[PDB]
């Protein structure tokens, strides 16, 4: 049973609900750690698209067939490039990952998939073909928090908590539902063309709570219990959402400009690096951060809690008033 | 030697192949493991074999040094393939991206250093993070399997005189102790005016002195294969001849005559010697039999094979039938 929804999906590429497609990307992760026998001439062709936009034809979904890529590629995530693509029977254009079936892990989908939280970019839905797995993925035109950064310096304080804000949003909204992101960082924070609305975008590090089995990311955004080994929950991403708080401040992550890699070591010895708080900045961010980049984290807040704590440091400093793009601030020393 | 290893490490080197080979025995090995916190800027290192690709300061990153640019090329065994321009020397190639997760340094190691007009020449690799860049040649006519599709089938003489190049890359590579492992139209590449092929992809190459062959696409696969006995070069023959009878039928072997896997069939059946088209000349007919022998032992190495072959495009009149001719209908199937 659900061993019976699966056989009745597997071979078809079908229009459907998540959670038909996530029994299907369990067994997609199952195979891709099974080293597979002689390809058929034909692909196998299977998956779930979750919206009319993407359509099947006759049960099937195949790159250059029914849909197809555009020239330039958008970004890089964790184990896939992303590129912009059409549906050619539609029109519609959105975004795709493509993973190769070795390294997908289904909580890739798992993760994100019937999610209804603004600050989460919407999953369109998933296709294989043969050791290809493309997800699908709402089309974002103001880039990533990350490119935003990088061009800009340094954000403002206000842009900085209203962007850290937002993202809190979401991940209570994961958390609430047993979801760690594991990932979290500018890089993986997209933007609206005006700037105004931000979503969470990567999933390929996340875990489906119920832990042993976290895939560290970025090591400048990680907590001191991922680093001791330690077993981990939704903690982790307030801390690494800190991380990036400081990196949208000062241009540049925390610990780079202070140590030599691997960070692992000085992250657990080392105290916070609430150290690279920038002075200028408001008492309640100061504070915010702070508990945030708590080391125990069963004494660090929550994201709902250090969400509060952020809504009112935007108060605190008048609310989103620093323009949309603007003039370069340059980044901290080292 | 650990020494060339640890040497070249961290850097993107102007170099030679037997470097890029050392290297990229690295990359195969640490592809294995869940891995650890990733650095914030990701590993780039590898080597180039050409002054056209050039690296600045010991780097060579995508979007920096070089980019892709217009549609997708094709899709390798274990990578997409695109267009790409050094931005340094204004030179285009091919690159094909691969996972690092997947990478089998005989993809490098079969084809490094190789100077056979009939192989696709390397022009090195390198790895930013969990990425492979492999830099080749661009081919400007598309690939056999392209060629065969858009032109339904292809006449005797085109066919023979593709599967002569083939063959001559094949023992090219089997002296040099080197299967291939993947032969078939959609890894032969075309220059544009049609009259050059060579073989591309070496994603499934293995680097002879098996148990360690990881198998291609079903139908073009020899009987000792599918049997799980071990494999040399004659595997490389039996795709081959599989592959001429793809472009005289415009469809391959078994698929019209039997349901998958066809792994058993071909263990069991008799070799699809029956597929040959009738109206074929006596010569090509006679060396696809002697290609496509069930025994690898009593099978035709890939330089014997090319003489009949070559003899054969003489006797039908050598080539003569016009690039990017008529489209000639291919074989239908059963009711
Ligand atoms: N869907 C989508 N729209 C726009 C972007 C991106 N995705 C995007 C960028 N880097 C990425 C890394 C991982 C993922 Br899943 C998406 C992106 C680059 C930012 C632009
Ligand atoms: N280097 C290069 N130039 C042109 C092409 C290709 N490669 C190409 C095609 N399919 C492929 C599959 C694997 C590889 Br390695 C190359 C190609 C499609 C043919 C076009």
Redesign the interface.
Same mark, same amino acid.
């Given at each position: 049973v659900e061993e019976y929804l699966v056989h009745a999906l597997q071979g078809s590429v079908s229009s459907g609900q998540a959670h038909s497609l996530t029994s299907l990307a369990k067994t997609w992760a199952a195979r891709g750690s099974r080293s597979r026998? /002689?390809? /058929? =001439?034909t692909e196998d062709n299977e998956g779930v698209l979750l919206t009319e936009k993407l359509k099947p034809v006759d049960y099937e979904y195949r790159e250059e067939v029914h849909w197809? !890529?555009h020239?330039? $590629?958008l970004g890089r995530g964790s184990?896939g490039?992303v590129h912009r693509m059409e549906d050619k029977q539609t029109g519609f254009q959105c975004a795709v990952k =493509?993973v $190769?079936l #070795? *390294?997908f892990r289904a909580e890739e989908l798992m993760a994100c998939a019937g999610l209804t939280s603004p600050r989460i970019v919407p999953l369109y839905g998933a296709v294989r073909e043969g050791p290809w797995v493309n997800i699908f993925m709402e089309l974002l035109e103001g880039g990533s928090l990350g490119q935003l950064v990088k061009e800009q310096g340094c954000l403002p304080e206000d842009r900085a908590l209203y962007y850290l804000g937002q993202a809190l949003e979401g991940l209570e909204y994961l958390h609430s539902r047993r979801i760690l992101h594991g990932d979290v960082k500018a890089d993986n924070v997209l933007l609206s063309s005006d700037g105004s609305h931000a979503a969470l975008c990567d999933f390929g590090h996340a875990v489906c709570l119920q832990t042993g089995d976290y895939? &560290? +990311? !970025? #090591?400048?955004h990680?907590a001191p219990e991922? *680093?001791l080994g330690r077993s981990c929950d939704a903690k982790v991403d307030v801390w690494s959402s800190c991380c990036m708080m400081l990196h949208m401040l000062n241009g540049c992550?925390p610990w780079?400009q202070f140590f030599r +890699? &691997?960070?692992?070591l000085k992250i657990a010895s080392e105290p916070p690096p609430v150290r690279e708080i920038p002075p200028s900045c408001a008492p309640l961010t100061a504070q915010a951060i702070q508990e945030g980049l708590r080391k125990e984290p069963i004494h660090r807040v929550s994201a709902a809690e250090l969400g509060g704590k952020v809504n009112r440091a935007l108060q605190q400093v008048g609310g989103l008033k620093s323009p949309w793009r603007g003039e370069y601030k340059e980044p901290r020393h080292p």
């Open positions: 026998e /002689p390809s /058929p =001439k197809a !890529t020239q330039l $590629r184990f490039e =493509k $190769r #070795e *390294v895939i &560290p +990311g !970025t #090591e400048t990680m991922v *680093v992550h780079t +890699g &691997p960070l692992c």
